[PDB]
Design a protein around this ligand. Structure first.
Ligand SMILES: [Ca+2]
Ligand SMILES: [Ca+2]
Lengths: 411, 80, 369, 369, 411
């Protein structure tokens, strides 16, 4: 038997619905979502850390000259100077006056401590979704975890469920994302090949242990003029540290909709937006026919003291009399009033009490105990406590959020 | 030389820094920056002859005279 | 990758700031100073090996260094003569090879020094060091009780490794003391029982190997040409203060000890705020003595987050709608708070004060209707 | 002028601080502190002659002391004990007479103390000495290679006169230990072999020179008499804590050592800015790790120059015109930049691209015409 | 033959000219200003440095009448007190109780090390302007320096150059200027003998070693109330040091027209402003008859594509059919298009390339090769790069700065 409805996508807040057939007693059906993750497909292109300039010991050729040919290591900057007379602790290192030349070079590679303190620049798009939801049918709780596209199925003990597309599709990540030390930022980093000195992305490398890295940090070798031998140089500030001092707050404490973000697969889990449509199929093992159901007649209700809030504050009393004795579901049909209870035992001439929560000042909602419908109404005062730690189980709907007395006055 | 008044002049035409004057190292080919100053001393590990010429301690009684007279090789200090 | 030190040797650097407040040659020149820890540990690298004797047999209480004298050999000195200071005295936590580790308060320089009597110097380089904390709630000394977070701190054991250092061939080192300028002709005098080579342009190119003193043909000035020995085969790191050899290839590697490791660490928790309740709002009554981070965000399509470091005893006002907000004060767990309708005035009043209730809720949509 | 050092003597001075942090009489009272050098050096004048013997025969390792006790004489100690400090211990670079040089870190006071021995004293006087640099490009340590500018450093030789100072004859110094109170009569007694000169009033003014325990004419309380020693004639500096003599003429003149001397010194050069061009303008992608000054000025009839100390990696947009601009950056040479007329468009071809070209140039002549 | 000429006062760049007589071969003439220094007439009036308060030993008189005289020292300040009791190390420095008096004494003088940073106060007026010219003509080069006053000629071995008065007149130096350590400030120090405690000129002295130092720094003595002996005082802060704290930018970085100010004669050397018309007189020996220089026919000028800019971007080529080998001068008869070279080697039927630097969008100027006049017109585009390190050679002229296309479109 097929059934379709639109459960709102809010984790932890269940909702109630019933199914009806011919010659079968209606049964309870509540679908609540326990967890919901939003995992996009990413693409890593390079990883960066702060540089560590390595200057090899300079080369001098006495009473001669030499040139230098380019190499492949990162930011290899070479330069030759003519007319130097190098000194060190043992003086007179060169037998030549203004004829010997020295050679200077200074490349760049990763620091030895940035196997932990590195940043990975990803590129995310087409964020998919999956959700785990509890389904209860005929007092037979079942656990499921399916995708969200309107194609992929999910089965567990004869429970076939199909979830439709989201009303509004979005992801909390922009096109370009960057991760360092387990927390996600949101930055517009340079592409793999456009390096700018003094900014993030100063060093590019596909892997942290790679052999052929590329970078440019505008090394400029100055001409030596001091007595002894030493190569002078000036260099721009490391882009990684400069961005680190100006990183801003992470996306952990900024993403909307209350999405909390895991970082190992770069998820975005447990946050609420839109409505997910469902299509649930139920077997016949949990359906009882009218020949075994208890018959209910002459339903009567009165409310004691109603209040509209997020917690179950309203109180309902249902007086009845039946023919047989057994278990009979009770459900509130209005979309602005849900019942805390799911099922209640029925007897000959009993009288049961219930609970409900509403979002409208008028608690005019119709309930049905095994199909015997009834109207039930009274006024509800606003609550004094206006700050709580529990989300509202029902949404605000116009034509009911305004009191009936106001309707009479303005009509 | 003397390409500016803040440095030193040598007859080779080379103008060297004033900080290189009388520092114990012959800098310009003329060798003029050491001719006008009061010398500090002989080194702690150096020997002083009667003429005042510092003699390295390694060059003593190695068989070859090195000082102005040969007092480094004299038997009064390192006998044969 | 090797570990024996019998095949290597230290060298002489050129420290920018010696003990006498002037740049000079020193046997304890420090090359790099890494400060990426969390307790404040520092991995200083100098040009002198620690923990080995003259032959390198791994003796914990002896360190090597290159001598000053001209017949230069590697000498010895006791280990308890090494002191490190940045602003006050540091304390030594370990040592292996060129490297050593320390931990001392933030300053503006990193100095190591031999406090002996014969060999006594103190190299100094410029390095900016500031105290670093982990998480929020800036602190000076970690508390005895607090939540445990992820720290990354150097481990004190020398048998770790994080890095890749390279030793090269030792370059030639000529000495001016070998030469003689007796009367008119230069004399090259080798030391006692050692072989030296001369390479020089006295008229033209001439090179030879001698062990005894010789006079050189056609020479008139002692500065014309140089001499150096050939008994140097032990490897030297490619510090920029040396002269590369004729090939200068990679000829061995050594470990950089004291690797960075993940380790749990305590962190303080702040005084719990006292929340008061008002219509569509929250007034946190915050109290702290050191910079504590308070951050809030909404739960709708827009989040309009906030982030401020507070230090005194203040109070802040936030606005909470129907979707609610959360705030993470200090190191505490986040808490979510939703708001509901408590607009003054009953929706079922006999007089016409119905408007003033539907004026707080739906503030503008009631005037138009 | 004079330099005969055997006929001068130190003296006791009143010092604002002491070992126990209270004003005391100390022989290491310091008068002035001069820090007008571009190197961090200091010249200190104290009240105890350094580098001289008991008689003053120029002993390089002794210093006069001016002992405390009665029958005061002139003794010495070793100069290994003298140590001065500002915030941490600092180095002594010379000494002669009352004066001694120093090289001390920035602080807020100058301390001079005798470290060990039988007597430990100190004298801290309030003076704000702080780090100063030469030219632009504020640094922390003198670099190895830079631009050589003209400094003015103290001459650490001792035989160089920086100035002029005066000497006078010592004043009378009475003592309390020369008076006796045993009965209703007063005795005064000199030490063994010395002649005191007593003078006081009781009934009338009287004086005299005695050698033994001498009586008086008559008076009850012995607080109304004084008795100083007569046989001291060594000169004393014009200090504000000494009793003047009767004449107090300028007897002798000795030197103030450590003359300020002009010399050269290295200062760093910053990183050359990369220049980005735009129509009638210029931008400097400045980068400096320490505060560096940037000065710009136009070349027209109005200069409207600027000057600012930048300390990061910023970019400052400047506007240059037909007459040009020049900008200096740190210690670099002044570089001039002139702007030419190249506006977007074409002065030919079609009419619609002539107005645009002649609008960037002369943005008001084209409108009126 | 005299030739009145106006030369723009811009050092470094030349300005070409052509001198032609009747029946004579034209002669080239260029005038380059290499150094232009203007020296005001200074008049030192006093020097000042940081003072050093010296307090002589306090004289005591043990119950005696005591008063002080008046001396000629700098800022002498007496005060006689009553009822003291000094205590040196040996207590009770007099016998006479509560009737003895002391006099304080405190005069100021120069600091021992102010001989290196002393500031000199100068008065400057009526600055002349000395210019070193460099004129060439007919392969003959001369180096002479002249005064710019309208009368006195600074003449070389053969030349006679009466440099006329300069059009504009300004002086970067004010009426009062102070000098310290080679940096030229611009202040208004108080006159000699009228000081102010806490400002510049707190202490005055004609010579640095002069003994007639006059000063006024309101040093006031206080009554001693201490058990020991010492004379208290409260003196105002030094004016020289406080001025040094907030002196401001020197005049080396504020003077207009780009003058770099040297301090030994107090120069304002090497800047550009105004015009300096001259009156040269070339000796007749350097000329030559018109029957010796070659004559040419069929001269046409072709203009290649140019960009009008400070540098010699514009190119040019010529055609000719000469009759005799020799050297002929070349010049452009326009005031807004300066050529590059003056002398050229004219062969029989060759071609000569030239260069210029035009400031107008259209180069419709006249080129004169060896006397013959030809005109060429062309259009060429604005330059590509809009920043150069070379000053402009000619002026906008506000006449040819508009193109002929705009001319005939508006007309
Ligand atoms: Ca030298
Ligand atoms: Ca010998």
């Amino acid at each position: 038997f097929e059934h379709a409805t639109t459960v709102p996508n809010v984790p932890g807040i269940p909702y109630k619905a019933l199914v009806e057939r011919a010659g079968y007693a209606p049964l309870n059906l509540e679908i609540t979502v326990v967890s919901s993750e939003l995992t996009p497909s990413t693409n890593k292109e390079y990883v960066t850390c702060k540089f560590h300039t390595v200057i090899p010991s300079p080369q001098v050729k006495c009473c001669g000259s030499l040139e230098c040919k380019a190499s492949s290591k990162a930011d290899y900057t070479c330069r030759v100077f003519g007319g130097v007379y190098p000194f060190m602790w043992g003086g007179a290192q060169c037998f030549c006056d203004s004829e010997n030349t020295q050679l200077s070079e200074a490349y760049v590679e990763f620091a030895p401590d940035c196997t932990i303190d590195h940043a990975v620049a990803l590129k995310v798009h087409t964020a998919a979704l999956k959700v785990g939801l509890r389904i209860v049918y005929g007092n037979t709780t079942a656990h499921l975890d399916t995708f969200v596209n309107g194609v992929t199925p999910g089965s567990s003990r004869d429970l076939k469920v199909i979830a439709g597309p989201i009303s509004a599709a979005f992801s909390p990540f922009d096109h370009k994302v960057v991760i360092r030390k387990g927390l996600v930022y949101n930055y517009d980093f340079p592409e793999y090949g456009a390096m700018k000195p003094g900014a993030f992305g100063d060093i590019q490398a596909s892997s942290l242990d790679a052999t052929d890295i590329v970078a440019r940090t505008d090394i400029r070798l100055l001409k030596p003029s001091v007595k002894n031998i030493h190569v002078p140089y000036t260099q721009a500030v490391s882009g990684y540290e400069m961005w680190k001092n100006n990183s801003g707050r992470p996306l952990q404490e900024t993403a909307p909709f209350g999405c909390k973000i895991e970082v190992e697969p770069l998820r975005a889990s447990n946050c609420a937006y839109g409505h997910i449509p469902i299509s649930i199929d139920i077997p016949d093992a949990a359906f009882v026919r009218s020949s075994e159901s208890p018959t209910i007649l002459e339903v009567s209700c009165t409310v004691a003291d109603c209040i509209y809030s997020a917690d179950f504050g309203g109180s309902l009393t249902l007086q009845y009399k039946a023919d047989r004795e057994g278990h009979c579901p009770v459900h509130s049909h209005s979309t602005t009033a849900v019942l805390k209870e799911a099922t209640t035992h029925v007897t000959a001439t009993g009288s049961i009490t219930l609970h409900f929560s509403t979002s409208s000042p008028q608690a005019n909602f119709i309930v049905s105990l095994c199909g015997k419908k009834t109207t039930c109404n009274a006024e509800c005062k606003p609550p004094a406590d206006h700050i709580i730690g529990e989300p509202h189980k029902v949404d605000q709907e116009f034509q009911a959020a305004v009191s009936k007395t106001s309707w009479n006055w303005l009509l | 030389a003397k390409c500016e008044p803040s440095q030193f002049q040598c007859t080779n035409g080379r103008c060297i820094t004033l900080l290189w004057k009388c520092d114990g190292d012959e800098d310009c080919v003329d060798g003029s920056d050491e001719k006008n100053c009061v010398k500090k001393t002989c080194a702690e590990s150096d020997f002083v002859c009667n003429n005042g010429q510092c003699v390295p301690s390694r060059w003593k009684c190695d068989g070859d005279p090195d000082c102005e007279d040969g007092s480094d090789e004299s038997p009064e200090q390192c006998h044969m | 990758i090797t570990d024996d030190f019998t095949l290597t040797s230290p060298y002489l650097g050129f420290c920018p700031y010696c003990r006498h407040s002037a740049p000079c040659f020193s046997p304890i020149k420090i090359e790099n100073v890494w400060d990426e820890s969390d307790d404040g540990s520092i991995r200083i690298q100098v040009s002198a090996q620690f923990g080995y004797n003259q032959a390198g047999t791994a003796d914990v209480t002896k360190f090597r260094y290159m001598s000053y004298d001209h017949d230069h050999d590697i000498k010895e000195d006791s280990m308890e003569k090494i002191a490190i200071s940045t602003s006050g005295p540091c304390r030594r936590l370990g040592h292996k090879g060129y490297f050593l580790l320390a931990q001392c308060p933030p300053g503006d320089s990193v100095t190591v020094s031999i406090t002996s009597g014969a060999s006594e110097n103190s190299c100094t380089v410029e390095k900016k060091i500031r105290r670093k904390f982990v998480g929020r709630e800036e602190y000076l000394f970690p508390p005895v009780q607090g939540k445990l977070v992820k720290c990354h701190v150097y481990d004190r054991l020398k048998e770790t490794s994080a890095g890749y250092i390279t030793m090269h061939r030792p370059g030639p080192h000529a000495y001016k003391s070998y030469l003689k300028e007796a009367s008119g002709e230069v004399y090259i005098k080798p030391p006692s029982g050692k072989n030296v080579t001369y390479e020089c342009k006295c008229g033209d190119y001439s090179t030879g190997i001698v062990s005894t003193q010789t006079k050189m043909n056609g020479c008139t000035k002692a500065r014309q040409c140089i001499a150096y020995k050939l008994d140097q085969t032990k490897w030297v790191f490619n510090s920029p203060d040396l002269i590369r050899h004729t090939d200068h290839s990679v000829q061995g590697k050594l470990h950089i000890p004291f690797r960075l490791t993940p380790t749990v660490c305590p962190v303080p928790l702040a005084h719990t705020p006292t929340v008061t309740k008002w219509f569509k709002g929250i007034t946190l009554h915050l109290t702290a003595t050191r910079p504590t981070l308070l951050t809030t965000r909404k739960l709708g399509l827009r989040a309009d987050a906030t982030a401020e470091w507070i230090t005194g005893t203040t109070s802040r006002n936030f606005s909470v709608g129907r979707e609610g907000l959360e705030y993470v004060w200090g190191n505490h767990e986040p808490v979510r708070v939703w708001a509901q309708e408590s607009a003054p005035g009953d929706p079922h009043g006999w007089p016409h004060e119905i408007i003033i209730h539907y004026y707080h809720r739906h503030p503008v949509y009631t005037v138009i209707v």
